[PDB]
Amino acid sequence: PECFTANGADYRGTQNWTALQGGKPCLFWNETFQHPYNTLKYPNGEGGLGEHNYCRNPDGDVSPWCYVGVYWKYCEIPACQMPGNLGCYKDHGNPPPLTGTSKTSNKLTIQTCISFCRSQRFKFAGMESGYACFCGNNPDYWKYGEAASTECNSVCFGDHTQPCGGDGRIILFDTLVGACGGNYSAMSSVVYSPDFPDTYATGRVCYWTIRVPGASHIHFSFPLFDIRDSADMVELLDGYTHRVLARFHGRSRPPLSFNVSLDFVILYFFSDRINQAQGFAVLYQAVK
Amino acid sequence: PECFTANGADYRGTQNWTALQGGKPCLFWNETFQHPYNTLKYPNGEGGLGEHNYCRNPDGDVSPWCYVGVYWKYCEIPACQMPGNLGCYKDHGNPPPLTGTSKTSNKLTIQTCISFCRSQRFKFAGMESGYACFCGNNPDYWKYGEAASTECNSVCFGDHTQPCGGDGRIILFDTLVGACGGNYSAMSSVVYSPDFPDTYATGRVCYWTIRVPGASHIHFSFPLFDIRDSADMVELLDGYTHRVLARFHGRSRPPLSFNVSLDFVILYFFSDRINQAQGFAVLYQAVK
Ligand SMILES: *[C@@H]1O[C@H](CO)[C@@H](O)[C@H](O)[C@H]1NC(C)=O
Ligand SMILES: *[C@@H]1O[C@H](CO)[C@@H](O)[C@H](O)[C@H]1NC(C)=O
Ligand SMILES: *[C@@H]1O[C@H](CO)[C@@H](O)[C@H](O)[C@H]1NC(C)=O
Ligand SMILES: *[C@@H]1O[C@H](CO)[C@@H](O)[C@H](O)[C@H]1NC(C)=O
Ligand SMILES: *[C@@H]1O[C@H](CO)[C@@H](O)[C@H](O)[C@H]1NC(C)=O
Ligand SMILES: *[C@@H]1O[C@H](CO)[C@@H](O)[C@H](O)[C@H]1NC(C)=O
Ligand SMILES: [Ca+2]
Ligand SMILES: [Ca+2]
């Protein structure tokens, strides 16, 4: 996976066509001087612009894009799909792709939808048309077929940096995403900060247990780590002893990655009441 | 103040009469071998027993006591009254000492009463008879007079380690006690962990601001510090910069005391979801 955000703001791969099939080539960011976004407005490489023509998302749009009057287009990047975004699917009406429950909200975000469905004990949450939230446990949310991820790019009504599906198009998420806690026993998975992909709420204490029977060690990486405060903190505890193995906060970041020689770890997050930020994504991989 | 707990479990002063006036002298704990409590059952000085006859509370009774068939008695120790316990007062009925609101609860504790009143925006909370909670903003809760603190020693129905008043006797607390947050501007005050004097709840994030216009420094001491986990933590932040000045947790305790050369500090507490403990009491004293 090359993206651990919902809008691929963290994408830093080398796709430079709007689509791998039938796409247009991207312009170079160090020559797009007519346009708002180019390397001269953003020295220091902010949002990943540089001396290339690779798809990027520097302005908080819903997906990566590039300059190509249609002077820019979204890129359809298959590897850029955060873990837990299960895809964009067609919704032909009756029955719907998820059959559990639904609501509409003028402030819908991915997480407010996810959160609504999770509450009600549903496995899957789907957003359509920017404002409609569908929940379900149905395994066959793909019933009407997959759609290009670009057909799910309506802005969420509550957050314009986030995609919320489309007309007859539903963007699907596992409701574990951004839960405040959870048990993980898979060989490898990703854990997101609470409320992800919204910024994390103030005053959260959340922990997740990672227990992989038979592991000799577990490898941790933090492909996303955007925690604001010395007071916000992410901690890994030894599961058996509760000893704090590592403490990360806004002023002491994680190495690319590191290994813990345990089969049982507890990841804790504490959020203060000062400033919120995008949060984190931790990828763990157990090794036998 | 010689006690920062509600039952004086932390009292370590030298009173060895049950009362300073008309009292009986206490027996020595290193010769009370008939009794459950003595220095041979508790080597390592637990609950402050040693080679003395000083009032102590090693068994989680509601107040300090000593051996003197009435073979033991509570001690009436004027200095042992935690900051925010405003005293024990007479209640002669109509009108009551606090006139705001009331409830009864089979699980009453000091904090559940305090919490109920605070919620409703009352300054004062009072417990009577072990089970009755009274709230009020009335300044004259002392209207019927003070009583010996020993007349307020009914066990709280929800916590037998805590006093909850008596028949016609009300024990009074400032509702700031154990609040999850607050602003302090006094020259000196005490801040307690959340839910104090109950053990702190799991999953709390609380902060209190101490801002004393014109202070050159603020002196902090921790006369009580009973935090269980490496994962629970108390932190002091610079108010202007939010820099974490000191981090204390279950495995790294505070010095007797220390000074911060600021007029503006934020005290933060984070409580994990593993084990709770009695909590803390921080005494600050600003200096000009
Ligand atoms: C895409 O970028 C690569 C550099 O990674 C470059 O070799 C190639 O010229 C690019 N293709 C197009 C059409 O820009
Ligand atoms: C921008 O950078 C590319 C890749 O190095 C370079 O080939 C190109 O000529 C540059 N264009 C300008 C206007 O700097
Ligand atoms: C972590 O785990 C693997 C063994 O599975 C090891 O080969 C690799 O070098 C380790 N990485 C670090 C940073 O220790
Ligand atoms: C009280 O204890 C003090 C020691 O601090 C001792 O001098 C004195 O003998 C005691 N008085 C009584 C009656 O025990
Ligand atoms: C206990 O300690 C006191 C104070 O030191 C001492 O005077 C007394 O004789 C001791 N009694 C016994 C039985 O050890
Ligand atoms: C703290 O403050 C006072 C000045 O008000 C100073 O005299 C005292 O020595 C200080 N204590 C510590 C531990 O610095
Ligand atoms: Ca924060
Ligand atoms: Ca704890």
Numbering used by the authors:
A (entry chain A), B (entry chain A): 30 to 97, 103 to 322
Task: Copy text from the publication.
Kremen 1 and 2 have been identified as co-receptors for Dickkopf (Dkk) proteins, hallmark secreted antagonists of canonical Wnt signaling. Mechanistically it is thought that, in the presence of Dkk, Krm forms a ternary complex with Lrp6, which is then rapidly endocytosed. KRM1ECD emerges as a rigid molecule with tight interactions stabilizing a triangular arrangement of its Kringle, WSC, and CUB structural domains.
We solved the structure of KRM1ECD in three crystal forms at 1.9, 2.8, and 3.2 Å resolution. The high-resolution structure is a near full-length model. The KR, WSC, and CUB are arranged in a roughly triangular fashion with tight interactions between all three domains. The KRM1 structure reveals the fold of the WSC domain for the first time. The structure is best described as a sandwich of a β1-β5-β3-β4-β2 antiparallel β sheet and a single α helix. The structure is also rich in loops and is stabilized by four disulfide bridges (C122-C186, C147-C167, C151-C169, C190-C198). The coordination sphere deviates significantly from perfectly octahedral (not shown). The F207S mutation recently found to cause ectodermal dysplasia in Palestinian families (Issa et al., 2016) maps to the hydrophobic core of the protein at the interface of the three subdomains.
